[PDB]
Structures are given as C-alpha cells and as structure tokens.
Amino acid sequence: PPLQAVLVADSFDRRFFPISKDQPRVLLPLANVALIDYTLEFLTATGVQETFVFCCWKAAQIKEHLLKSKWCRPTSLNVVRIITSELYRSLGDVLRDVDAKALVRSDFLLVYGDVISNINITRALEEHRLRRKLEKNVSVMTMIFKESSPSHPTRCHEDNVVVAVDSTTNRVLHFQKTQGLRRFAFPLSLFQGSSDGVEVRYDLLDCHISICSPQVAQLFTDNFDYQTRDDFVRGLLVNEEILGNQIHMHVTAKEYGARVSNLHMYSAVCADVIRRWVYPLTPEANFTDSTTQSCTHSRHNIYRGPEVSLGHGSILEENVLLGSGTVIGSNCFITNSVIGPGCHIGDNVVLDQTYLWQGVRVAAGAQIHQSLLCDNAEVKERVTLKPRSVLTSQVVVGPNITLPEGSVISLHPPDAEEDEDDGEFSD
Amino acid sequence: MEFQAVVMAVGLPVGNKPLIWYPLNLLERVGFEEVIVVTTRDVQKALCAEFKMKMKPDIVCIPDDADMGTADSLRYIYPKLKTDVLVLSCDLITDVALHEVVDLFRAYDASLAMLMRKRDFIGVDSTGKRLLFMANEADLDEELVIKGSILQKHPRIRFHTGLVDAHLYCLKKYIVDFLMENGSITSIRSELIPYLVRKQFSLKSLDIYSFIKEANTLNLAPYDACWNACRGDRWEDLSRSSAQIVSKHLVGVDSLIGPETQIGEKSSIKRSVIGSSCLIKDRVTITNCLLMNSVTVEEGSNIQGSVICNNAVIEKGADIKDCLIGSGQRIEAKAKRVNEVIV
Amino acid sequence: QVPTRKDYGSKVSLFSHLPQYSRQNSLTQFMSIPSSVIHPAMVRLGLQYSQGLVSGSNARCIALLRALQQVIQDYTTPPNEELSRDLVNKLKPYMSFLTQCRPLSASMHNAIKFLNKEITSVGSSKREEEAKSELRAAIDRYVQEKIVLAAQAISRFAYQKISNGDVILVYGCSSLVSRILQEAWTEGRRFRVVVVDSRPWLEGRHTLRSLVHAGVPASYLLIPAASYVLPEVSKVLLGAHALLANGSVMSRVGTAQLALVARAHNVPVLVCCETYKFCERVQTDAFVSNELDDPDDLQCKRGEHVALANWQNHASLRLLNLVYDVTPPELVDLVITELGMIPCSSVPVVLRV
Amino acid sequence: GSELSERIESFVETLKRGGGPRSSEEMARETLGLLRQIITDHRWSNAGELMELIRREGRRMTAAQPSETTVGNMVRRVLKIIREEYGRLHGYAQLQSNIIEAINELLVELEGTMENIAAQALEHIHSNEVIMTIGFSRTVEAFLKEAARKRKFHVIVAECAPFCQGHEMAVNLSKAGIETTVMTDAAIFAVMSRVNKVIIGTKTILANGALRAVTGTHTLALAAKHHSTPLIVCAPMFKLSPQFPNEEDSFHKFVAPEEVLPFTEGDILEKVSVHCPVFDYVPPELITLFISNIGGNAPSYIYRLMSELYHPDDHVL
C-alpha cells in the first residue's frame, strides 16, 4: 500500500511568541529555508508520497509560501492538501478529523510540524508491519526514537524524556517527562506484567516521529479526551487493563530527528545542521531547487551563498551560512552565524553564535552574541546583546545602547519585554 | 593472602551427602585454608561435633548466643576478622567457579560484590556489572523510585525480577568497620547491601558489582528443591549408590545412598534420593522422594513427593502419599493424602 | 603454575613469532583465588591490566609502581634469607605474570629494570622494615622526579614555543600532550586544536574530553582523513609511548603515518616525551616488538554487517592490530624533553649518559 | 514525454541522497540509459539543440552531486558522440539512428570493462607476493580473484576508518581462498616496507592524472612514493572526468559527521566541530600505472584520452 503521512504545521507549544506575530511558527527560516521543507525532504527520503499537512493558525501564510514548494511542483512525488481548517488547536481534533474523512488508508506515519531528520523509517516501518500483521492489530503504535546522551544540547532545560520499555519485543511500558524530578516512579505493574527483563532509558530523544495506524484515529475518536500525543500514550499505558494494545517502541542509532520546540532547540538544531549532522540535508545540497539557495560550500565549514562580497580581513572561523545578497566590511568577525539574505554589515563587528535573518542590518562596531533577529531587524553602532536576546519585526536599536539578556523586543508593548522603538526604552 | 572464608551459616548436612558442609568443601577446593564456621548454640553444642564428623583437616567452629542475625554475628565475630572478609551463607550448593566474582572484584577495586542466579526486584547496569538498585515489594508498595541522579549519570538500566542470589559477598575491611559502628544494621542481605547502594551517590567513591548466574542456587524452605541437586549431585561427585550395598534389581532412577545401609529385597526408587543406614529391606516400592535414616520401612511404600526423616516407622501394612515424617511417628500403617502433611 | 594463554589464532605469516592474546582467557580463570604464590596486589594489577583498564603508558607505570609499593611493604623475607635476592626471585614470576596477561611496554620495562637494580643495590645490613620504608620513599622519589615533576618541566619548555594564531594537531591518550596543551592554554595562549584518532581502540576521545572540558576549541577527525587537515596545521604534536636507541621514535599505530604525511605537507613535527620511558633496544624495522592485542575487537559495526562475522571460519582471513609504528629519525624534527628542545637524531647522546 | 521527466527525477533523487546505485559502472549504465531516453524521446531542429538540452541536463546532474562526476563524463562523452556525428555527416535527420548505435557501441564496450582488466592481472602479480589495497573497489576484487586462479599470493586490505568499506573485500577474498589479511589504516606505513605494489581503487580520474580516491588513499600513495613501490590504479577509462583539481574545493563528499564521532557522546558536541571527508586527493606525480581497458598507462598518458574522449570545449559543461 502507499505510505501516507498526516502532518500538522502548528505545533501547539506556542512558545515562539512574539516571533509568532509576523510569520507563523512552522514557516520559520532556520538556515534560510523552511523547516517544513526539511520535514518534507525527510518524508520524501523515507519515501512517503501522500502527505496531509495541516495548519489552523495562520494557514494563509503557509499556503502562500508552500505553493512554490519543493514538493508543490507538478513533477513532485508528494501530493499535499493544506486543509485550511481553523477549528482545532489540539492535535486530538485533527486526528479525529483524519478519522472524519477516512484520509489515512492504513499504516500511516504522523509527524509534528518541524522535525529535523534524515531517518529511513523503512526499517521501523517494516518491523511495525511485521508485528502488526503477523500479530493482527495487537499493535496500535510503534514509537521510533534516537539514542543520545542527556548532557547534549539537544535536551534543553525544558524537555527531556524517560521511558520504561520491554527488551523482548521492545514494547513501551511507560513514558514520562522529567521537568525537575530528582527521583522517578515506576509501578511493579511493569513486572507483574512479565518476569523476563524490563529496561528503563533516559537516552532517547523527543524524536516525535511516531509511526501509528489509523486505529490511532479510532483510539482518539472513541475517547474525546486526548489533546496531545503524550495524552494518548499515557492514557493507553494506564488503560492496559483492557483494550490497550500497547506501543512497540524502537530506537535508531545513526540518525538525527528532533522536533524543534523552543528558541534554544532552534539554536541547537540550526547550529548542528550547519555542521552537516543530518547530511543529506544541508543548503549547499540546495535540496529545494529554489534559486537563491545556491550555497557554495567552501573551506572549513564556511558556507557562502553567491555574491557575498565578503569584507577585507573579515575572518570567519567556522559554520557561517552567509546567505545570498549579503555584504560585509573590514574586520567583521563572524562565527557560528546564520547570515540570511539582505544583510548589510559594518566594521569591527563580532556576531558569535548569532542567528540573523532576511532584511536584517547592522552598522559598524556593533558587537553581538548568542543573538537572534528577523525581517529588517536593525541594530546600529556599538550596541550589544546577550543570550536569547530576540528582536524581530523590524525593531531598531539606537547607538551606544547596550542591552540586557532577555531583551525580547517586538511590535507590541504587552507581550514583549519592550516595544517597537528606535532607541532602547520608550515604545 | 587477602581474604578469610568466613561463613555466615547457622543451622544437618542431610542426605547421602554432607550438604551444609559443601560451601566449605568447595571453597576449600580453591585455596582458603581458613574457614570460620559459626555454629548453633541457642541450646547446646549440637553443631561442632557434627563437624568433627567430617573430613576436612582445616575447619573451625564458632559458638554463639540466642539470636544472631547476619550483620549481627558479623559485628560479633568482627575482632578476629583481620583482612578483606569473604562472607557466605548456609546453603551454597552451587557449582559457580567463584573465580568470576572475585575476578570482577579484584579488577575494579570493588567495595562489595555478590552473585545472582536465575520479591526483590533489582536494577542492573547496561554492562551488567555495576548494579544500580535492589529492593523487594515488601520495602515499598509499588513505586520503583530511582533517584534521577544515577539515570543522569548511568544512562541505561536493565531490570531483574528473575533472580536467585546466593548471599555470597566478597567485602572490604573498611565496610566491615562501617558496619561495626552501625549497631542498628542487623542483617546484610535485607538492610546492609541496599543501604550501601543507596549511599553509592551523595575515584574514591564506592562500588557494587553484581553477577547473573545460570548454574545453581541456594536452598530454602522447600528442600525437595535440592532434589534437583540430588539428581545433579552425582555429577558434582565426578571426582568430588555412589557406595552402598546395592540391589541392582530394585528401581534405581537417579538414586543416592551411603554405605552400610538398608539392603534387602523387593524395593524400588524412582527419580529421587534415599537415606543411609536405616531400616528399609522388606517388600517395598518407590516413593519418588527422599528420606532420612532411622525410619523403619516395610510393606510397599506407595508414597510420592514427601520426606521420611528420623523419628518415623512403618511395617506390614504401610502406605502413604506426600505426608512428611517429622517427629512423633511410631507408625506401621497410615494411608496418607498427597496434600500438606508432616506426620 | 602459570600457563601461557593461547596465541589467538594465526597471525600474518610474517607475524607468526610475536604473540596475539585475547581477553576472555582471563588467566585467573584457573588459579587459586586466595592469591598464594601470586602476589595479591600483583594479580589485582594484572587482572585489571589485561582486560584493558589501564592504557596510558605513563599511567600504566604509575599503577605498576603503586602495586609494587604495596608488594614491597607487605613483603617479608624468609628466615635470614637476603632480601635483594629472594625478593627479586619472588618478583620474576610476578613480572612473568604481568607479561602473560599483557605485553610489557618500554615504560614499564625501564621501571622494573630500575627496581631490580635498586633492590639489588641496598646492602645486606638491611634492617628489614627500614629497608622497605627506604624503598617506598625511593620509589615515590622516582615517580615524582621522572613523571610528576617532568610534566611540569616539559610544559615550562614547551609553552614558549606555541604561539598565538596557530592550530595544533594531536594524537591519542598521551597524558603528556593533554597536560602541555592544558597548561600552555591556562598561561593565556589562544589557539584552535585538532585531534586525530585511529580505530579500533578509538582513543583521541580521552584528550578530546580533557580539552573541550578545559576551554580550548577543538576539531576531530580520523587518521584516514589526516591528509585533509594538514594544509592548515602549523604544528603536529605527538605523544611517544616509548623512545628507542637509534634516534627513531615509537608510538601508537597512528603516529609515523602522521609524521610522514606531515613531512610531505611540510609542517614541523614536534614530539613530547620524558626520559625514563626511553628503552635501549634498537629498531628501524617494524615487526621487531609490536604486541598484537586481541584482534577480535576490531570487527566493525554497520547496518547489521559485522563484516568479520567469524575471524575464524574464514581460514583465508587473518587479523592484526599493530600497536606501534616507529617514526624514523629524519621526519620528526624537534623532540621536546625535560632536558631541552633537542633535535631527534641526537636523542641517544643526551639519553646514554 | 513527461515519463522521461519522471525517470529523470527518480534518478536525480536516488542520486541526490546517498548510495545509489551502490555500484559505479552501474551508475554509468543507468546514466547512459537515461541519456538514450533523452534522445529517443525528443527531436531537434539542428543537433545544436540536442547538445544544448543534454548540456542543461548534465549541468543539473553534476551540480546536484559534484562528488560523483561519473555521469558528468558520461554526458560529456555523449556530447562528444553528437559532436562527432554532426561533424562527419554534415561536414541531417536519419543520423538519429547513427547516434543510437554509438550509445550501444559505447554501452557494449562498457559491459566488457571489468573482464578486460582481468586479462592484465595474470601478467603483473607473480605468485607469493604481497599486494596492498584500500577499499572494496569492485574492479580490484575482479582483478585479484581473477589472478588468483593460476597463482597464489597475499593481499592485505586496509580499512577506510569511516566505514567497514575495507572489510567486505576481505570476506570476499576469503570466499575466494587467497589467505588475505585485514588491518587498520593507521598501520599502513607500519607494514609499507613489506608491500610490493599497492593495488588501489579509484573514484575519478581528473584531467591532471590526479585521481580523487576513496579516503585513506593519500596516505597510502604517500607511503608508496616514500618506499618507491609502484601504484596500480584499477581505473576503467569511463571513470575519467576532465576536471582539473583547483575549482572551489567542492571536492570531498562530506558525509554524516555521525560516522567518526557518533552522537552518543554527551555535551562535548557543543564546541567540537567535526570533519569527515570520504574522498581525498592524491597528487598525480606519485601515480605509476593506469591499468585500464587498453593496458598500461602513465600519468601524462591520461590527458591523451582526455584529448580524445571529451571535446575540450565543454568542461565548463
């Protein structure tokens, strides 16, 4: 049978506020490319071809950009249906909705908005198939996950995962997050279930590439009380007395799938995809034939779009996706950056770890750090910033003005810790 | 040397084979001249002469008091313990080549060790050497509490409810001392070891080094279990029935018997072991069970799965079924029922 | 007594003479647990030694010497039997055990040879515990002098070389290089670092940790990619797990190759080493002393492809893990040592004295 | 005619991600096939239009994955063929037929390549001698286990440390009973004294005689030049490409940095960039022998074929 993949392009961890004001979450430029693109290239890599995307909040801009998709070409292998429904705000309803129109034939692979991945599901896909039809629907879900180590910057302060699993069929036994739990709690339910070895793990990522089966749309319709996948899995893990038909977990070893959630996660995944950690996917492969993403990979992980006019003596040690249209002056010391298109720079500037974007601009001698910007975001002479110091929506900063850490300024007083300005204070 | 085969054994090496003596025997096979063997002095001296009844030129006998818990008797014998001890429990009947556990110990400077053949769910490491948790359902109701620290350091844990440990603990002198000041810690197996593992986390830290086993075990309240042992025992008796007045006509099926014993006519034995120097010589049959001596046997013992210990008798009309022979059986005919009965 | 573990399978036809050991034949699988003839601390050492829990040659020295401190202090002489003879006589089976669990490195070799020389040294008017206490003191004097103070001196020499702006290549668990880099970084220098590792006992990790956890920016790559990095490196910098007689320098499997690719890319080859490691046998050849540790570990991991499903059933396939190569003198121009920044070909003189 | 476009996609994709096809000469064959389809599913006012079209297509091809330029030179030679046909037979329409046969001709010659090389083997390697090889280069498995039916000798295969890519050949020569050995690349200079003539695979032949090889080869060739034992390139001539090393250093397939330092390693991956080039350079001045479809050849010799195979005016493609 074909391999169809439900997909929702509004991850309800609505954290990229105020950034979510101008352009929606999913459309975000990570490395001058749509995350949703990364996801779609993934879907094509594992070879699925009938993908059902979904966006409720701000579906307009989604279609606006995705009409010219790498997979919205007539030659594409993937067919897409942006069902522009603005009723649900929890995945529960969209899963009962793919129930409500019998879209998924059978054996689908649901996926959140902006998973960064290179994973070949086919190994999983087939073992799922095996223990689902050589076992006749005793499965409902076969979670896929990716081995890691806790200390990595993939698991930010916010989100980790810890899970009890079996070791014979690798079936899930319990799933739970660990936002500040110096201890944990596992019931002997585990062992009164079976006396042949049980495993606990804290070294799987929040891969969020759940394989599933339309009877998951069943398990969501039959009980209208689930609003997220974790709701699903813990409800089914407690409802094992009857009609559980538990999850058959499975971990990979060689790939990299992360459901980017928070600005720290975006940070980590961007400055790991520049390091080719996911390759095939990296903008010098220009996987979206979209023109201006011609990225002339070069010495020592320095990427370089065409026509960057890099400034004299501007050292750039590593991992600098200088996008198209850029221009740079003398001594501009960039590092780990992502300089999008339309980025004029001054002199003596340092931009360690920064993430500029399109439209951005900056004058001379303007040290920055750990930063982030957005469309026409501007900071003039001798400004300075600090970790997570977002600033978007064309915000400006005046000369001489240092700024503190969380300086998330934007086009709104009430939500940003500043407002659209051309100084520092005074909205 | 660096050890002492101190044996925490209380309470007899029954059968056609000196069972209780066998932990000694086996450690004796691999060096270990010294064997501290605590005895039973809750009433009288009923255990030491029983060791004078044995054949190891280097054994030692230790009297005791009313009640001696494991760590309690540890603290008791503590002074004469002047090395890294090697404690050991009563019913070691297990062909484990002990070189593996002391191997692991002598390797990773282990503050402890133990064994586990295949209550008491445990968490063992990925590599299966540095265990990380032990408990039982008695300890706590249901919540497998594991302090997030260790999962934040030791990444992947396998579990084990399918275990039969053998209470064998290679130690280190300073842990014996750490116990000697801990007057309240009564028993090693129940409280000490889990306390130490609890204190594994707040290289000069401590260690715990378990081991999975699939060869033999430690006997408990069902001693008919070690009939397994009996069936297997003769293999242990390769160079370390076997010698008796045999009949070669009566049923011999995985049997065992000592010399100068019940040799008569018209008997049988099916898949079990026997006693030594008792009265079983009349018209008899198998009992698929084991017996101790001084139990006059006669008239076709149609029994199955029981014990005929001392203080028993039967003659000329006898028949039984899974009814153990305890004390107070001056019997000659008592048709028994296979349910729980010890007459 | 102590049998010799089986030379695992067959070697390269040429390699038929050197030994090829394993780790599952844990020699204590047969001995008597209360270590009666074999010394307790000694057998503990050898057991944690063969299974691969002590790697860094200098660390392996430190370990052996601690264990022999313990042996000495526990030693007793027989009734009025002279120490210098009877001790060493107990020692010979102990060193034979250390060999038959793992081949002995030039560092341990010079160590044990010094110890024989010094045990034989102290006169036969020896108050027993006095002799043993003086020996413990002298042993610790040795270690502090030659491997605990040396590192300091080597760093003091090196720091004045490493400039600012200049990346440096490293190779492997060499404690000395990790120390040099860490120190001369702490004294304020500013430079990238690149590490190169060689499978199977992938070890560059050790230094990679002890560097990135110390602040210095790193960059990793395996030695079959070394030819890539050299158009950037301004100094290779290599450990030396032994130093031979004829000017050459022995090291792990992946050293002389680094030096060679370097000379062909014209980049100045340093090395760092401390005196007492220096052996005295001579070798410009390659197969005269290169122990063959358990080759079975080599088998790779891909897909489900253990491309060496059997080392054995494939009688047309033979493995090896040459532990050491030997950079010829000419290549490695500068060999820093606690006596100075000497050039390589002149190393036998300042070490023969 | 869109079915052509869909096959073009199918390829371009299978190309644009990773191993496909896992054989090189295969890649050549599917290439030529797709090219034949471009011709037979199109027409042209003048052959110049077909030159133009196939040049656009080859641009997409080589620009997509410039790490494997085999198909680059296949479209180069097809441009040569059309150039030659429009040269001869107009120096107009029926010549399409002409074109087709050329392909078949080229095609069928390709189908013999491996076996051709076989015939050379039985000459060079005199028995009971030691040959060194880095990789599973199919041509060399052909070479050796086709010269291991009259003699016996000893081949030591190194291992590209990224993969086990230098072990499959060990298991194969085991399946051919030659008593071969495995080793770890860092030890090649260790045993380079006891080699006789290294037999190496190759992945391209630049117009400078400088072969771009599977990684861990520059060191092999350097050790060779040092010991001055000769280099046996097992390069079928279709693997040529008229690239001259120095352009933009889009030069080494940078594979998933997951290979060298897998992701299991904690936080140290926050200030530790990684490199892993699977394809390295070897300077031509170390080459000795281009064992090839037409027997022995030397470095300089190579541009002769680059003189004749691909018309020089299209290395910019």
Closest by CA to B236, choosing from B97, B52, B50, is: B97
Query: How does DSSP classify residue B296?
Result: E
Contact A223, A103 (CB under 8 A): no
Tokens of A308: 């960057």
What's the distance, Cα to Cα, between the start and end of chain A in Å?
A: 57
**Using CB atoms, which residue from A181, A184, A199 is nearest to B159?**
A199
Length of chain A: 427
Closest-CA residue of chain B to C50: B107
- Nearest CB to C48; choose among B31, B32, B107: B107
Structure tokens at A419: 């407002």
C-alpha A204: how far from chain center: 17
CA distance B98 to chain C (A): 8
Nearest residue of A to residue D18 by CA position?
A: A280
Residue range of the domain that includes D223: 118-308
Length of chain B: 343
Return the closest-CA partner of residue B277 out of B252, B260, B263. Answer: B260
Please answer whether residues D139 and D199 qualify as being in contact, where contact means their C-beta atoms are separated by less than 8 angstroms.
Answer: no
- Tell me: cis bond preceding A18? Omega within 30 of 0 counts: yes
Q: What is the CATH number of the domain that holds A59?
A: 3.90.550.10
Residue of D nearest to C299 (CA): D164
Calpha distance D91→C328 (Å, rounded)? 64
Q: Give the C-alpha separation, C319 to A240, whole Å.
A: 52
CA D91 to chain centre: 35
Cα separation of A198 and A166, whole Å? 5
Q: How far apart are CA C48 and CA B104, in angstroms?
A: 9
Half-sphere exposure of A182 (CA within 13 A, CB side): 2
In whole angstroms, what is the distance from residue C229 CA to residue C221 CA? 9
CA distance linking residue A91 with residue B213, whole number of Å: 48
Residue C26 is nearest to which of B1, B98, B103, comparing CB atoms?
B103
Give the helix/strand (H/E) hosting D169: helix D168-175
For residues C108 and C60, is the Cβ–Cβ distance under 8 A? yes
What would the two tokens of residue D232 be?
A: 């046996």
Spatial CB neighbours of B122, under 8 Å, sequence gap ≥ 6: B116, B131, B133, B134, B135, B159, B160, B161, B163, B210
- DSSP collapsed to 3 states, chain C: CCCCCCCCCCCCHHHHCCCECCCCCCHHHCCCCCCCCCCHHHHHHHHHHHCCCCCCHHHHHHHHHHHHHHHHHHCCCCCCCCHHHHHHHHHHHHHHHHHHHCCCCHHHHHHHHHHHHHHCCCCCCCCHHHHHHHHHHHHHHHHHHHHHCHHHHHHHHHHCCCCCCCCCEEECCCHHHHHHHHHHHHCCCCCCCEEEECCCCCCHHHHHHHHHCCCCCEEEEEHHHHHHHCCCCCCECECCCECCCCCCEEEECCCHHHHHHHHHHCCCEEEECCHHHCCCCCCCCCCCCCCECCHHHHCCCECCECCCCCCCCCCCEECCCECEEEECCCCCCEEEECCEEEEHHHHHHHHHC
From residue D30, give the alpha-carbon distance in Å to each of B149, C93, C304, D27, D36: 56, 67, 28, 5, 10
* D315: CB partners within 8 A, 6+ apart: D76, D207, D242, D243, D244
Token pair recorded at residue B220:
């408990």
B213 three-class SS: strand
Q: H or E segment at D51?
A: helix D47-64
Is residue A90 within 8 Å of residue A228, measured between CB atoms?
A: yes
C-beta atoms of B31 and C36 within 8 A? yes
Q: Is D174 helix (H, G, I), strand (E, B) or coil?
A: helix
How far apart CA B284 and CA B300 sit, in angstroms, is 4
Beta bridge partners of B339: none
Count contacts between A and B (CB, < 8 Å): 67
Under 8 Å between Cβ of C8 and C24: no
Of B30, B107, B108, the CB nearest to C32: B30
Element housing D34 (H / E): helix D24-40
Find the residue in B nearest to A168 (Cα).
B158
Nearest to C222 among D164, D177, D260 (CB): D260
Cα B332 from chain centroid? 34
**Using omega within 30 degrees of 0 as the cis cutoff, is the peptide bond preceding D299 cis?**
no
Token duo for residue A368: 């920055």
Work out the minimum CA distance from C285 to partner chain D, whole angstroms: 9
How buried is D285 (Cβ within 10 angstroms: 0-12 exposed, 13-18 middle, 19+ buried)? exposed
Is there a contact between A183 and B123 if contact means CB atoms under 8 Å apart? no
- Residue A189 CA to chain centroid, in angstroms? 35
Residue B342 and residue B53: Cα distance in Å, rounded? Answer: 28
Give the type of residue at C25: N
Provide the phi-psi class of D295: left if phi over 0, else alpha when psi is between -120 and 50, else beta.
left
Query: Hey, are the CB atoms on C307 and D167 less than 8 Å from each other?
Result: yes
User: Which residues in chain D have their CB less than 8 angstroms from residue C314's CB?
Assistant: 171, 174-175
Closest to D186 (Cβ–Cβ): which among C257, C305, C308?
C257
Residue D173 DSSP SS3:
helix
Residue B152 one-letter amino acid: Q
d(CA A13, nearest CA chain D) in Å: 25
Cβ C240 vs Cβ C249: under 8 Å: yes
Is residue A282 within 8 A of residue A274, CB to CB? The reply is: yes
Say yes or no for a CB contact (<8 Å) between D176 and C316: yes
Tokens in use for C310?
């059997």
Cα separation of C45 and C39, whole Å?
Answer: 10
DSSP B282: S
Cβ separation of B2 and C35 shorter than 8 Å?
Answer: yes
> Domain boundaries in chain C?
1-153, 154-353
For residues C246 and C255, what is the distance between their CA atoms, to the nearest angstrom? 17
| Dist. CA D114–CA D189, nearest whole Å | 30
Degrees to nearest 5, angle at CA D38 with D35 and D40: 110
How far apart CA B155 and CA A201 sit, in angstroms, is 7
CB atoms under 10 Å from CB of B141, counted, come to 8
Look at strands B156-160 and A198-201 and give their pairing. Answer: antiparallel
Dist CA A424 CA A400 (whole Å): 10
Ordered alpha helix ranges (H), chain B: 22-29, 49-52, 70-77, 99-107, 148-153, 173-181, 193-198, 227-236
Closest Cα in chain D, distance from residue C246 (Å): 17
DSSP string for D189-242: HHHGGG-S-EEE--SEE-TTS-EEEESS-HHHHHHHHHHT--EEE---GGGB--
CB D160 within 8 A of CB D216: yes
Structure tokens of C108?
Answer: 């341990």
Residue D296 belongs to domain with CATH number: 3.40.50.10470
Residue-wise burial string across C63-89, b where 16 or more C-beta atoms lie within 10 A, e elsewhere:
bbbebbbbbbeebebeeeeebbeebee
Q: Encode A16-38: b = buried (16+ Cβ within 10 Å), e = exposed.
A: bebbbbbbbbbbbbbbbbbbbbb
Q: Is B156 helix (H, G, I), strand (E, B) or coil?
A: strand
Residues contacting C129, CB < 8 A, separation 6+: none
Distance CA A123, CA A47 (A): 12
CB-based contact B73:B65 (threshold 8 Å): no
Q: B132 near B206, Cβ under 8 Å?
A: no
Helix, strand, coil percent values for chain D (each to nearest 5)? 50, 10, 40
Label each residue of chain A as H, E or C. Answer: CCCEEEECCCCCCCCCCCCCCCCCCCCCECCCCEHHHHHHHHHHHCCCCEEECCCCCCHHHHHHHHCCCCCCCCCCCCEECCCCCCCCCCHHHHHHHHHHCCCCCCCCCCECCCEECCCCCHHHHHHHHHHHHCCCCCCCEECEEEECCCCCCCCCCCCCCEEEEECCCCEEEEEECCCCCCCCCCCCHHHHHCCCCEEEECCECCCCCCEECCHHHHHHHCCCCCCCHHHHHHHHHHCCCCCCCCEECEEECCCCCEECCCHHHHHHHHHHHCCCCCCCCCHHHCCCCCHHHCCCCCHHHEEECCCCCCCCCCCECCCEEECCCCECCCCCEECCCCCCCCCECCCCCEEECCCCCCCCEECCCCCEECCCCCCCCEECCCCECCCCCCECCCCEECCCCECCCCCCECCCCCCCCCCCCCCCCCC
Residues C73/C136, Cβ–Cβ less than 8 Å: yes
Residue C239 near residue C177, CB atoms below 8 Å? yes
Three-state DSSP string of D53-97 = HHHHHHHHHHHHCCCCCHHHHHHHHHHHHHHHHHHHCCCCCCHHH
Q: Kindly list the residues of chain B whose beta carbon comes within 8 Å of any beta carbon in chain A.
A: 121, 123, 137, 142-149, 151-152, 155-162
DSSP element (H, E) containing D7: helix D2-17
CA atoms within a 13 Å half-sphere pointing along the CA-CB vector of A30? 30
CA B241 vs CA A365, B26, B248, B274, B296: distances in Å: 99, 22, 10, 9, 20
Does an H or E element contain D156, and which? Answer: strand D154-157
CA distance A299 to A290: 24
Amino acid identity at B295: V
Q: Please name the residues in contact with B51: beta carbons below 8 A apart, sequence gap of 6 or more.
A: B21, B37, B39, B59, B61
Please, are residues B18 and B25 in contact by the beta-carbon 8 Å criterion? yes
The separation between the first and the last C-alpha atoms of chain C, rounded to the nearest angstrom, is: 40
Spatial distance between the Cα atoms of C97 and C90, rounded to a whole number of angstroms: 11
> How far is the alpha carbon of B150 from chain A, nearest alpha carbon, in Å?
9
**Element spanning B133, H or E:** strand B133-134
| Helix D24-40, helix D95-124: angle, nearest 10 | 170
Interchain pair A191, B147: CB under 8 A: no
Do residues B112 and B86 touch, judged by C-beta distance below 8 A? no
Q: What angle do CA C222, C225, C231 make, to 5 degrees?
A: 120
Cβ atoms of A370 and A354 closer than 8 Å: yes
Q: At a CB cut-off of 8 Å and minimum separation 6, what does A205 contact?
A: A145, A146, A147, A148, A154, A155, A161, A257, A258
Domain residues for A34? 4-263
Interface of A with B in 191-210 (CB under 8 A): 191, 195-203
Residues of A in contact with B123 (CB under 8 A): 200
Please say whether the beta carbons of D208 and D246 come within 8 A.
no
Phi, psi of A245 (to 5 degrees): 55, 65
Residues 264-283, chain D: which have Cβ within 8 Å of A? 264-267, 269-270, 273-274
Distance CA D120, CA D142 (A): 11
C-alpha distance across the termini of chain D, in Å: 25
Give me the CATH topology for the region B4-238: Spore Coat Polysaccharide Biosynthesis Protein SpsA; Chain A (3.90.550)
Of B142, B146, B148, the CB nearest to A187: B142
Q: Which chain D residues contact residue A276 at CB under 8 A?
A: 254, 256-257
Q: How many CB atoms lie within 10 A of CB B268?
A: 17
Contact C50/C322 with Cβ under 8 angstroms? no
Handedness of CA C163, C165, C166, C168 (dihedral sign): positive
Q: Which residues pair with D295 in a beta bridge?
A: none
CA separation for the pair A45, A57 (Å, rounded): 28
The answer to whether C233 touches C194, Cβ cutoff 8 Å, is: yes
In degrees, rounded to 5, the angle at the alpha carbon of residue D64 between the alpha carbons of residues D61 and D69 is: 60
C-alpha distance from residue C264 to each of B47, C261, C331, D60 (Å): 82, 5, 10, 37
Please tell me the distance from the alpha carbon of residue D22 to that of residue D168, in angstroms, as a whole number.
13
Taking contacts as CB-CB distances below 8 angstroms, the residues of chain B near A184 are 144-148, 151
User: CA distances (Å), D298 to each of D114, D122, D232, D288, in order?
Assistant: 20, 20, 10, 6
Q: Are A7 and A54 in contact (CB under 8 A)?
A: yes
> How far lies B41's CA from each of B38, B76, D20, in Å?
9, 14, 81
D261 at A interface, C-beta within 8 A: no
Q: Token match 């029922």: residue?
A: B337
d(CA B71, CA B189) in angstroms, rounded, equals 9
Closest-CA distance of chain B to residue C223, Å: 29
CA-wise closest residue to D134 among D155, D118, D109: D155
Cα(C242)–Cα(C58) distance, integer angstroms? 10
Closest CA to B155 of B121, B120, B130: B130
Contact present, D278 and D255 (Cβ < 8 Å): yes
- Is A39:A7 a contact under the CB 8 Å cutoff? yes
